[PDB]
RNA sequence: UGCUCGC
């Protein structure tokens, strides 16, 4: 009797895909920023006021946004598209406005709409234009409807912010230090100030160090600081156990040694372990106590708050503190940082609300300081506010935070780098996997090898397979398919239902109730909240009440058994993934559910209402139990996997069936997927980026995931499928390399369209002169322009249609050398390229500052050849080895002759036995008319295609009968054939490519530049000249290294021995002993250095005989 | 003007990255190298 | 051959000249010439019954 | 973007089938049925006229014009 | 002599000469393109 | 929209009635083409509303 | 300088 299972389940995932998912994080979390968060940052600095002349303030009432506008017209607002900023090399901004109450001359005077600043609007928001839009009106507004967006337009450029990942605040970290030992620490951070304090048992007795001392003091004497003075009771708030008072006996000795005894006493230690923040203004007039008492209440563990100087739920935490470290002394239960019930997910929205806070207090600072120099000293004419007001302030700010992508706020003294990345538009899935990357706080610069690895925590949260091969693996990952980051909440109604269950307050009982076995502790956000008896009813009522709706439904709750303590966990970032929740062996989701939820009688809304489906954090799945499918239900089973295949992101949703294959065959298939060639989106034709890639005829995939079909992927393909038959021909396929077929290639077989552009700009100068551009210089000889400006038209810009050869100009642009007739020189912007290109398109636009911006967009169509890399969406990168005729391939009995042809080899070392079932699933749906599923943990199983293939007469295997078309006989083993989604991929021959003649040298050191756009060399590295000296090749060395590279003639002295110019020598003003000497110049260079840093190499030269 | 023949027919003519002042008439490479 | 919107034009003239299917695939004249050996099935011993 | 006018692999004249082929689509005939109709026997041409997407609407809708 | 372009939404042939202000009639969209040259271009079927 | 190169593909792709034995290989270069070897096929279509 | 990549 099998368990029933509910077939159209999965039907739940593309229902949550309608209101949360991929795109929708970024987009809410810039929505809350711009609608709430930014109304609270404005309340919280509502009145700024300057200390001289008193009654005079400058009051905010209500901050907007409005929709994005452009400031082109003059003093005039104009609706822009985001295509149009694109377009226009411009930002896609709103101006953020403010309305105010001021006093001029004692007299209150009101504005209602006065600017102060532009915040870049994300595309797809609520303020955005695309938002609310049909595919029809993106289209009358240039804008690809399957665009994911949430990205930021700025000059331009498409800048994303990727999701930050750090540590969870305010959390007791018990930790081994370098030496082995078993310490504690705690980041107490406040919206004020973060204060790591640490405890250590360095010498058996425990230390407390913070930041603000000078020595770190032993934990008793912060004890007798802290209000309680008697030791009975120290010893019962660290806890009663024998094995407790044995470990906590030598602090208590230590504390006996000196004469502290009272709470004054020990005040005063402090104070004198107590350094002056570098001569604070102000007199002190004995602080000393007080500043160890202030210490104490606001420095020392801020986000334990103490209500007037009562240390009580201070001394509490402490205690417990302590006795984490005592039982974490014995059993070495370390607790993990890789653990990401601990991790917390910053979005965009906290990053742009502490940047626009930052920015206000300092326009707020700004606007002070020009308040005192100006109001007292100027004239009875009253100063206002409204004529200092910069409006520029916050705009540079924001635009230079989101282009440069380094963050500095002093305020809270966070340098940051890296925040935005430029979106890469190689394919529609690079995009749509680079809008869910999360970056690591580790900031990868060195081996760390510890947060790299996988931790089983990441189940259903983020991607396992999806990571860059590189130097990046395991520092940037990417979110699961279904997944949700929680936002912050009230904290109101969980206080007052925890108040309600029973949990006694810490301060009405001593600290020895915490050392019961049946005591656990219950906390909120790093907070104590109290103490619990049978803390499993606790944990069933708090959790139906989140299920009936009076708590919100992201509020997590978990139980540590070992440390006994249950955590309330209710702040922003954390993961939760929604489960079906199960009841007794059976789920509450049936078959009724999933078919009102397919007529539309309820949504995603409706089931987490209905107690139906439930949003867990990793803590709180932590201690529930988690079924894969109905069968697996157990009698201890609390919820119910929605999807499995939910578990990989979006780039791992495109491998079919990639449980059939090797780990890193699916992580070299995302990174090659990343990079696959194919369509951007409807608007790609109007779309100007600096590089594209389009494929000529692209095709979707026969063997689709649902992944897919929910990404809509198929709408967008990057591949097209050919007959692929995995054989071995002519050894030139020996590892990893393919053969492609050359009638297939000459049909349109993996063409592809290369788009470059070429920028130019006509900016007016501080003089009232311009950039401008000649007209085609005419031969007189043939009354006709010059093979160098044969492409350009009348006005001097090169007209669309035309074909651009090597060294030719597109605009000739000249520009004034003045800034009394003016001077132009010539800079026209020739084309450095190796083949010929198509111009398509010549925009011309005309920004604000009358400065021309003209984009040529040149178009390449390329044909593969030896040397195009290609991938076969199982990361079996290979490059075409040869290209041979169509009557050379081998053909079928049907007269069917293979377009790529793959080595077999690469199958038994990397097991992609996934890739068979992929070219067996594609077979059987291009004989049957169908399109199998290579859903992951699932999909068209292996009889259900043989079973296909028997019926349409051909092998049930793939293996057929196949006649070798060289030789004309037929081959003694039947060969592997079927249709195959292979990708190329960008990494062209052409473009890599590279010679390097004589040519330029550096300026400072004259060798070879770096790059081959700066037309460089390749270098010789160290390990070479090693491989050189071990090969013992002295000559060759010396011509590489000396004569080839920075050879030079140099004129040396014999009698000082220093270096002299055109044979003589300044020092001894003799030329008698001048001698030239060949040299690397970077040696010359090395001495001319040692000689400025007073180490003067003297030369002693000598004949060479 | 050319060193070799005494022309001036001086161009500025790349040749594969190598940015080169040639004479025209004669061939002969005036300067070469920046 | 392609689609159109009201605007856009397309005019051109094509030079054809004779060429072989070696020098490029669109000069094949045939889609598909081939060959296969005829298949003879035989019976070692005489099969009867379901 | 476009149908191809010639298959890959064997070279048979396809983009001519094209249209019709939406009529099929337009008509009740499956895609099994339909390419069976069309005349493709090999699964070559059957993969480029059902694998194939036609972008070049969504493109024209983009157009000048 | 007369430079012809051509709008981004209107797509109606403005001619406008050296230093003016990028704009069209009946509009106000600052998107210019060029037209396409007239002269004769050859292409290979390769 | 169609590229003017994959235009040219396309039209290279398109079959010919024309009888080969009737024709000669072009020589090598002679773009300008003769009577004897190379035929003429002009397309002009102007898309506009009904 | 930064960063995404290619092995
Ligand atoms: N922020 C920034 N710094 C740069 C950039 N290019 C170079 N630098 C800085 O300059 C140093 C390297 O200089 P190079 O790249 O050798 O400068 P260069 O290419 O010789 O300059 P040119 O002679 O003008 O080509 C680095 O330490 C960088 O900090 C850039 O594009 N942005
Ligand atoms: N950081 C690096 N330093 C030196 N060589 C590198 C580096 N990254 C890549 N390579 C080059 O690439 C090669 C690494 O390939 P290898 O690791 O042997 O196979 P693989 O990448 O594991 O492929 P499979 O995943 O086994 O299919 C060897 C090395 O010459
Ligand atoms: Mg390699
Ligand atoms: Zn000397
Ligand atoms: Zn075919
Ligand atoms: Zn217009």
Known sequence: ?1105 | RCPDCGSTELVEDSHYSQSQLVCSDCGCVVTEGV | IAQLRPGQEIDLLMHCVKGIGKDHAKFSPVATASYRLLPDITLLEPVEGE | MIIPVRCFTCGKIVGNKWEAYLGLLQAEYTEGDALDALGLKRYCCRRMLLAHVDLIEKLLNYAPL | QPMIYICGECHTENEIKSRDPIRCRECGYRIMYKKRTKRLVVFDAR | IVQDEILAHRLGLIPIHADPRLFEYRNQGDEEGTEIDTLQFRLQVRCTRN
């Open chain 1, 1 to 1105: 009797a099998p368990i029933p299972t509910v077939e159209e389940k999965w039907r739940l995932l593309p229902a949550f895909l309608k209101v949360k998912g991929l795109v929708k994080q970024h987009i809410d979390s810039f929505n809350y920023f711009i609608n709430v968060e930014i109304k609270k940052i404005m309340k919280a600095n509502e009145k700024v006021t300057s200390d001289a002349d008193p009654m005079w303030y400058l009051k905010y009432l209500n901050i907007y946004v409005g929709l994005p506008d452009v400031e082109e017209s003059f003093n005039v607002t104009r609706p822009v598209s985001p295509h149009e900023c694109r377009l226009r090399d411009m930002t896609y901004s709103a101006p953020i406005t403010v309305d105010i109450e001021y006093t001029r001359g004692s007299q209150r005077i009101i504005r209602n709409a006065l600017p102060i600043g532009r915040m870049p609007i994300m595309l797809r928001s609520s303020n955005c234009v695309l938002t609310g839009k049909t595919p029809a009106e993106f289209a009358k507004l240039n804008e690809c409807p399957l665009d994911p967006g949430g990205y930021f337009i700025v000059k331009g450029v498409e800048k994303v912010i990727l999701i930050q990942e750090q540590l969870s605040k305010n959390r007791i970290i018990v930790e081994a230090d370098r030496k082995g030992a078993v310490g504690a620490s705690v980041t107490s951070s406040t919206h004020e100030k973060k204060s790591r304090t640490n405890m250590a048992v360095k010498q058996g007795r425990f230390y407390l160090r913070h930041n603000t001392l000078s020595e770190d003091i032993p934990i008793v004497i912060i004890f007798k600081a802290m209000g309680v003075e008697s030791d009975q009771e120290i010893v019962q708030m660290i806890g009663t156990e024998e094995h407790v008072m044995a470990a906590f006996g030598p602090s208590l000795e230590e504390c006996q040694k000196a004469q502290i005894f009272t709470q004054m006493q020990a005040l005063k230690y402090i104070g004198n372990k107590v350094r002056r923040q570098r001569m604070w203004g102000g007199g002190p007039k004995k602080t000393k106590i007080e500043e160890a008492r202030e210490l104490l209440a606001s420095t020392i563990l801020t986000h334990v708050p103490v209500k007037e100087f009562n240390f009580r739920a201070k001394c509490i935490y402490t205690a417990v503190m302590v006795r984490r470290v005592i039982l974490a002394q014995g059993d070495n239960k370390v607790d993990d940082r890789d653990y990401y019930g601990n991790k917390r997910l910053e979005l965009a929205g906290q990053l742009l609300s502490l940047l626009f806070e930052d920015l206000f207090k300092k326009f707020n600072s700004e606007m002070k300081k020009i308040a005192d120099q100006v109001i007292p000293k100027q004239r009875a004419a009253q100063f206002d506010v409204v004529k200092h007001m910069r409006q520029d302030q916050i705009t540079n700010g924001m635009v230079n935070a989101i282009s440069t992508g380094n963050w500095s706020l002093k305020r809270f003294k966070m340098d940051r780098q890296g925040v935005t990345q430029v979106l890469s538009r190689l394919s529609y899935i690079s995009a749509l996997g680079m809008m869910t990357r999360i970056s690591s706080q580790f900031e990868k610069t060195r081996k760390v090898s510890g947060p790299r690895s996988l931790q089983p925590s990441q189940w259903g949260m983020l991607c396992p397979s999806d990571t860059p091969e590189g130097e990046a693996c395991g520092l940037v990952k990417n979110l699961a398919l279904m997944t949700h980051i929680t936002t912050d909440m009230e904290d109101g109604p969980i206080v007052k239902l925890a108040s309600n269950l029973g949990v006694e307050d810490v301060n009405l009982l001593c600290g020895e109730e915490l050392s019961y076995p049946n005591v656990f502790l219950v906390f909120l956000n790093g907070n104590i909240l109290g103490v619990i008896r049978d803390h499993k009813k606790l944990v069933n009522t708090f959790r139906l009440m989140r299920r009936a709706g009076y708590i919100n439904e992201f509020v997590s709750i978990s139980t540590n058994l070992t440390d006994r303590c249950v955590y309330i966990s209710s702040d922003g970032g954390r993961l939760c993934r929604p489960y079906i929740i199960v009841k007794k062996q059976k789920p509450a989701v049936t078959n009724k559910h999933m078919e009102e939820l397919a007529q539309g009688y309820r949504n995603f809304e409706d089931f987490l209402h209905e107690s139906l489906v439930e949003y867990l954090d990793v803590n709180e799945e932590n201690d529930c139990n988690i079924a894969l499918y109905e069968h697996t239900i157990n009698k201890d089973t609390t919820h119910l996997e929605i999807e499995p295949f939910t578990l990989l992101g979006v780039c791992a949703g495109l491998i079919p069936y990639p449980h059939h294959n090797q780990s890193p065959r699916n992580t070299y298939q995302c990174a090659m997927g990343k990079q696959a060639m194919g369509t951007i989106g409807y608007n790609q034709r109007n779309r100007i980026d600096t590089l594209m890639y389009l494929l000529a005829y692209p095709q979707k995939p026969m063997v689709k995931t649902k992944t897919i079909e929910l990404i809509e992927f198929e709408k967008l393909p990057a591949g097209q499928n050919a007959t692929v038959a995995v054989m071995s021909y002519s050894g030139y396929d020996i590892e990893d390399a393919l053969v492609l077929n050359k009638a297939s290639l000459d049909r349109g077989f993996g063409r592809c369209l290369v788009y470059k552009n070429a920028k130019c700009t006509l900016k007016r100068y501080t003089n009232q002169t311009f950039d401008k551009v000649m007209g085609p210089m005419l031969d007189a000889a043939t009354r006709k322009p010059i093979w160098r400006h044969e492409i350009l038209d009348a006005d001097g810009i090169c007209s669309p249609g035309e074909k651009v050869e090597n060294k030719q100009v597109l605009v000739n642009k000249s520009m004034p050398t003045v800034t009394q007739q003016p001077q132009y020189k010539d800079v026209p912007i020739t084309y450095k390229g190796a083949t010929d290109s198509y111009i398509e398109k010549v925009m011309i636009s005309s920004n604000a500052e009358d400065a021309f911006l003209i984009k040529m967009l040149l178009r390449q169509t390329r044909r593969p050849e030896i040397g195009d890399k290609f991938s076969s969406r199982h990361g079996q990168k290979g490059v075409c080895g040869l290209i041979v005729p169509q009557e050379d391939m081998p053909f079928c009995d049907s007269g069917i002759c293979p377009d790529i042809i793959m080595n077999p080899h690469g199958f038994p070392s990397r097991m992609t036995v996934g890739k068979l079932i992929e070219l067996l699933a594609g077979k059987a749906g291009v004989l049957d008319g169908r399109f199998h599923y290579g859903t992951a943990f699932g999909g068209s199983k292996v009889k259900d295609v043989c079973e296909d293939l028997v019926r349409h007469g051909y092998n049930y295997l793939g293996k057929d009968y196949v006649t070798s078309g060289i030789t004309g006989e037929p081959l003694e083993a039947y060969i592997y054939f079927g249709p195959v989604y292979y990708q190329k991929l960008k990494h062209m021959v052409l473009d890599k490519m590279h010679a390097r003649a004589r040519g330029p040298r550096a300026v400072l050191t004259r060798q070879p530049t770096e790059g081959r756009s700066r037309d460089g060399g390749l270098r010789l590295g160290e390990m070479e000249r090693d491989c050189l000296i071990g090969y013992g090749a002295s000559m060759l060395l010396l011509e590489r290294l000396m004569i080839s590279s920075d050879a030079f003639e140099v004129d040396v002295c014999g009698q000082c021995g220093l270096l002299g110019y055109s044979g003589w020598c300044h020092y001894c003003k003799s030329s008698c002993h001048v001698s030239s000497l060949r040299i690397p110049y970077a040696c010359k260079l090395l001495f001319q250095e040692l000689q400025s840093m007073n180490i003067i190499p003297r030369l002693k030269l000598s004949k060479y005989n």
